[PDB]
Amino acid sequence: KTHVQLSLPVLQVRDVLVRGFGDSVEEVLSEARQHLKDGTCGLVEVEKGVLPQLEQPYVFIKRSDAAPHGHVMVELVAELEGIQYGRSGETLGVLVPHVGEIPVAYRKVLLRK
């Protein structure tokens, strides 16, 4: 399937134990996709002060369209030193590994895979 319905645990930035997916744009996009498939991916909602507490490169989920079955259609865009790899809509948040942190909410998305 080109799209997969996922429910992403929303984590508080200060709870996150592993603050990024790796060391290159290509690696963080790869790892993000692997964790999304394996159900081991969390989402941090971006506000003032959140991104400097996480590790670059960043992986964003961005709205790709204007929402089947409650699931917002999203795609992945990476960012490193102010350059984005991909072009998409509004940021729903920044993806991080999930290693058992308690979420505050779930974000239903339809991920372009």
Curated annotation (Swiss-Prot):
Task performed by this protein: Inhibits host translation by associating with the open head conformation of the 40S subunit. The C-terminus binds to and obstructs ribosomal mRNA entry tunnel. Thereby inhibits antiviral response triggered by innate immunity or interferons. The nsp1-40S ribosome complex further induces an endonucleolytic cleavage near the 5'UTR of host mRNAs, targeting them for degradation. This inhibits the integrated stress response (ISR) in the infected cell by preventing EIF2S1/eIF2-alpha phosphorylation upstream of stress granule formation and depletes host G3BP1.
Gene that this polypeptide is encoded by: rep
Protein localization: Host cytoplasm
Phylogenetic lineage: Viruses, Riboviria, Orthornavirae, Pisuviricota, Pisoniviricetes
Residue numbers spanned by region Disordered: 1-113
Region of the whole protein represented: 11 to 125 of 7096
CoV Nsp1 globular domain location: 2-113
Descriptive protein name: Host translation inhibitor nsp1
